[PDB]
Coordinates of N, CA and C in Angstrom, one line a residue:
Chain A
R12 N -39.8 -64.8 5.8 CA -40.2 -63.4 6.2 C -39.2 -62.5 6.0
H13 N -38.0 -63.0 6.0 CA -36.8 -61.9 6.0 C -36.1 -61.8 4.5
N14 N -37.0 -62.3 3.4 CA -36.6 -62.1 2.2 C -35.4 -62.9 1.8
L15 N -35.1 -64.0 2.4 CA -34.0 -64.7 2.1 C -34.6 -66.0 1.2
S16 N -33.5 -66.8 0.7 CA -33.8 -67.9 -0.2 C -33.8 -68.9 0.7
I17 N -34.0 -70.2 0.4 CA -34.2 -71.4 1.1 C -32.8 -71.7 1.8
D18 N -31.7 -71.3 1.1 CA -30.3 -71.6 1.5 C -29.9 -70.4 2.6
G19 N -30.7 -69.4 2.5 CA -30.3 -68.2 3.4 C -29.6 -67.1 2.7
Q20 N -29.4 -67.2 1.4 CA -29.0 -66.0 0.7 C -29.8 -65.0 0.5
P21 N -29.3 -63.7 0.8 CA -30.4 -62.7 0.4 C -30.6 -62.3 -0.9
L22 N -31.9 -61.7 -1.0 CA -32.5 -61.6 -2.4 C -32.4 -60.0 -2.7
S23 N -31.9 -59.2 -2.1 CA -32.0 -57.8 -2.2 C -30.6 -57.2 -2.1
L24 N -29.9 -56.6 -3.2 CA -28.7 -56.1 -3.2 C -28.8 -54.9 -2.3
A25 N -27.7 -54.6 -1.4 CA -27.7 -53.4 -0.6 C -26.9 -52.4 -1.3
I26 N -26.8 -51.2 -0.3 CA -26.2 -50.1 -0.8 C -25.6 -49.5 0.4
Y27 N -24.4 -48.5 0.2 CA -23.8 -47.9 1.4 C -23.5 -46.5 1.2
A28 N -23.7 -45.9 0.0 CA -23.3 -44.4 -0.2 C -22.0 -44.1 0.1
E29 N -21.0 -44.6 -0.8 CA -19.5 -44.4 -0.7 C -19.1 -43.2 0.1
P30 N -18.1 -43.2 0.7 CA -17.6 -42.2 1.5 C -17.0 -40.9 0.6
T31 N -17.1 -39.8 0.9 CA -17.0 -38.6 0.2 C -15.6 -38.2 0.0
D32 N -14.8 -38.8 -1.0 CA -13.4 -38.5 -1.5 C -12.4 -38.2 -0.5
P33 N -11.2 -37.9 -1.0 CA -10.1 -37.3 0.0 C -10.4 -36.0 0.4
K34 N -9.6 -35.1 0.9 CA -9.8 -33.8 1.4 C -8.4 -33.0 1.1
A35 N -8.7 -31.8 0.7 CA -7.5 -30.8 0.3 C -7.3 -29.8 1.6
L36 N -6.0 -29.8 2.0 CA -5.6 -28.8 3.1 C -4.6 -28.0 2.6
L37 N -4.7 -26.8 2.9 CA -3.9 -25.7 2.5 C -3.3 -24.8 3.6
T38 N -2.2 -24.4 3.3 CA -1.5 -23.4 4.3 C -1.4 -21.9 3.6
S39 N -1.1 -21.0 4.5 CA -1.0 -19.6 3.9 C 0.1 -18.8 4.8
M40 N 0.6 -17.8 4.2 CA 1.6 -17.1 4.8 C 0.7 -15.9 5.6
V41 N 1.1 -15.4 6.6 CA 0.5 -14.5 7.5 C 1.3 -13.4 7.7
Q42 N 0.8 -12.1 7.6 CA 1.6 -10.9 7.9 C 0.9 -10.1 9.0
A43 N 1.8 -9.3 9.6 CA 1.2 -8.4 10.7 C 1.7 -6.9 10.7
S44 N 1.2 -6.0 11.3 CA 1.6 -4.6 11.1 C 3.1 -4.5 11.8
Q45 N 3.9 -3.8 11.0 CA 5.2 -3.6 11.5 C 5.6 -2.0 11.3
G46 N 6.4 -1.7 12.4 CA 6.6 -0.2 12.4 C 8.1 -0.1 12.0
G47 N 8.5 1.3 12.1 CA 9.8 1.8 11.7 C 10.6 2.3 12.8
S48 N 11.8 2.8 12.6 CA 12.5 3.3 13.5 C 12.4 4.9 13.6
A49 N 12.6 5.6 14.6 CA 12.5 6.9 14.9 C 13.8 7.8 14.8
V50 N 13.6 8.9 14.8 CA 14.7 9.9 14.6 C 14.9 10.8 15.8
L51 N 16.1 10.9 16.3 CA 16.6 11.9 17.6 C 17.2 13.1 17.0
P52 N 17.2 14.2 17.8 CA 17.9 15.3 17.4 C 19.6 15.0 17.3
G53 N 20.1 15.6 16.3 CA 21.3 15.3 15.9 C 22.5 16.2 16.7
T54 N 23.5 15.6 16.9 CA 24.7 16.1 17.6 C 25.4 17.3 16.5
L55 N 26.2 18.1 17.0 CA 26.8 19.0 16.3 C 28.3 18.5 16.2
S56 N 28.8 18.1 14.9 CA 30.0 17.7 14.8 C 31.2 18.8 14.9
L57 N 32.3 18.4 15.2 CA 33.5 19.4 15.2 C 34.0 19.7 13.8
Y58 N 33.8 18.8 12.9 CA 34.4 18.8 11.6 C 33.3 19.4 10.5
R59 N 33.9 20.0 9.5 CA 33.0 20.5 8.4 C 32.3 19.5 7.6
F60 N 31.2 19.8 6.9 CA 30.5 18.8 6.1 C 31.1 17.8 5.3
Chain B
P23 N 38.6 17.6 -12.3 CA 39.2 16.3 -11.5 C 38.6 16.1 -10.1
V24 N 38.1 17.1 -9.4 CA 37.3 16.9 -8.2 C 36.0 16.4 -8.3
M25 N 35.3 16.9 -9.4 CA 33.9 16.6 -9.9 C 34.0 15.3 -10.3
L26 N 34.9 14.8 -11.1 CA 35.1 13.5 -11.5 C 35.3 12.3 -10.4
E27 N 36.0 12.8 -9.6 CA 36.2 11.7 -8.3 C 35.0 11.5 -7.6
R28 N 34.2 12.6 -7.3 CA 33.0 12.6 -6.5 C 32.0 11.9 -7.4
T29 N 31.9 12.0 -8.7 CA 30.8 11.4 -9.6 C 31.2 10.0 -9.6
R30 N 32.5 9.7 -9.8 CA 32.9 8.2 -10.0 C 32.4 7.3 -8.8
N31 N 32.7 8.0 -7.6 CA 32.3 7.1 -6.3 C 30.7 6.9 -6.3
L32 N 30.0 7.8 -6.7 CA 28.6 7.7 -6.8 C 28.2 6.6 -8.0
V33 N 28.7 6.5 -9.1 CA 28.4 5.7 -9.9 C 28.8 4.2 -9.7
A34 N 29.9 4.2 -8.8 CA 30.4 2.8 -8.4 C 29.3 2.3 -7.4
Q35 N 28.9 3.1 -6.5 CA 27.6 2.8 -5.7 C 26.4 2.3 -6.4
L36 N 26.1 2.9 -7.4 CA 24.9 2.8 -8.2 C 25.2 1.1 -9.0
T37 N 26.4 0.8 -9.3 CA 26.7 -0.4 -9.9 C 26.5 -1.5 -8.7
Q38 N 26.7 -1.0 -7.5 CA 26.5 -2.1 -6.3 C 25.0 -2.4 -6.3
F39 N 24.2 -1.4 -6.4 CA 22.9 -1.6 -6.2 C 22.2 -2.4 -7.3
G40 N 22.7 -2.3 -8.6 CA 22.2 -3.2 -9.5 C 22.6 -4.5 -9.6
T41 N 23.9 -4.9 -8.9 CA 24.2 -6.3 -8.8 C 23.4 -6.8 -7.6
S42 N 23.1 -6.3 -6.6 CA 22.2 -6.7 -5.5 C 20.8 -6.9 -6.1
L43 N 20.3 -6.0 -6.9 CA 18.8 -6.1 -7.4 C 18.8 -7.4 -8.3
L44 N 19.8 -7.6 -9.1 CA 19.8 -9.0 -10.1 C 19.9 -10.2 -9.3
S45 N 20.9 -10.1 -8.2 CA 21.0 -11.3 -7.4 C 19.6 -11.8 -6.6
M46 N 19.0 -10.8 -5.9 CA 17.9 -11.0 -5.1 C 16.8 -11.6 -6.1
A47 N 16.6 -11.1 -7.3 CA 15.7 -11.5 -8.2 C 15.9 -13.0 -8.7
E48 N 17.2 -13.3 -8.8 CA 17.6 -14.6 -9.2 C 17.3 -15.7 -8.1
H49 N 17.4 -15.2 -6.9 CA 17.1 -16.0 -5.7 C 15.5 -16.1 -5.5
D50 N 14.8 -15.1 -5.7 CA 13.5 -15.1 -5.5 C 12.8 -16.0 -6.6
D51 N 13.2 -15.9 -7.8 CA 12.7 -16.7 -8.9 C 12.9 -18.3 -8.8
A52 N 14.1 -18.6 -8.2 CA 14.3 -20.0 -7.9 C 13.4 -20.5 -7.0
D53 N 13.2 -19.7 -6.0 CA 12.1 -20.2 -4.9 C 10.7 -20.3 -5.4
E54 N 10.5 -19.5 -6.4 CA 9.2 -19.4 -7.2 C 9.1 -20.9 -7.8
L55 N 10.0 -21.5 -8.4 CA 10.0 -22.7 -9.1 C 9.8 -23.7 -8.1
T56 N 10.6 -23.6 -6.9 CA 10.4 -24.7 -5.9 C 9.0 -24.8 -5.3
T57 N 8.5 -23.8 -5.0 CA 7.1 -23.6 -4.6 C 6.1 -24.1 -5.6
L58 N 6.4 -23.8 -6.9 CA 5.4 -24.4 -7.9 C 5.5 -26.0 -8.0
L59 N 6.7 -26.4 -7.7 CA 6.9 -27.8 -7.8 C 6.2 -28.6 -6.7
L60 N 6.2 -28.0 -5.7 CA 5.4 -28.5 -4.3 C 4.0 -28.3 -4.6
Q61 N 3.5 -27.3 -5.1 CA 1.9 -27.3 -5.3 C 1.6 -28.3 -6.4
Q62 N 2.3 -28.4 -7.5 CA 2.1 -29.4 -8.4 C 2.1 -30.9 -7.8
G63 N 3.1 -31.2 -7.0 CA 3.2 -32.3 -6.4 C 2.2 -32.8 -5.4
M64 N 1.4 -32.0 -4.8 CA 0.3 -32.1 -3.9 C -0.9 -32.5 -4.7
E65 N -1.2 -31.9 -6.0 CA -2.2 -32.3 -6.9 C -1.8 -33.8 -7.4
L66 N -0.7 -34.1 -7.6 CA -0.4 -35.6 -8.0 C -0.7 -36.5 -6.8
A67 N -0.3 -35.8 -5.6 CA -0.4 -36.9 -4.5 C -2.1 -37.3 -4.3
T68 N -2.8 -36.1 -4.5 CA -4.3 -36.5 -4.3 C -4.6 -37.6 -5.3
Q69 N -4.4 -37.4 -6.5 CA -4.8 -38.4 -7.5 C -4.1 -39.8 -7.3
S70 N -2.8 -39.8 -6.7 CA -2.2 -41.1 -6.4 C -3.0 -41.9 -5.4

């Protein structure tokens, strides 16, 4: 009834649908918004330019 | 003579900029090779 031989050996070759390969993992650089310095009013020097 | 002194100081500073520009490019291109080797190594690792 279970498709076996008289000795118990199976008569139908099975299948398993092989697992899907290795995996690629990558990393990336990340940048963010950056500001600059400000300018203040200047002092008056005692010396010439 | 005064014009020569002021000009000569500016040219020396310009030389300083050129040296730094070449040095940075050398270091940046060396890092480019190291990055390329690691990326190529990863492809080899997948096949291994």
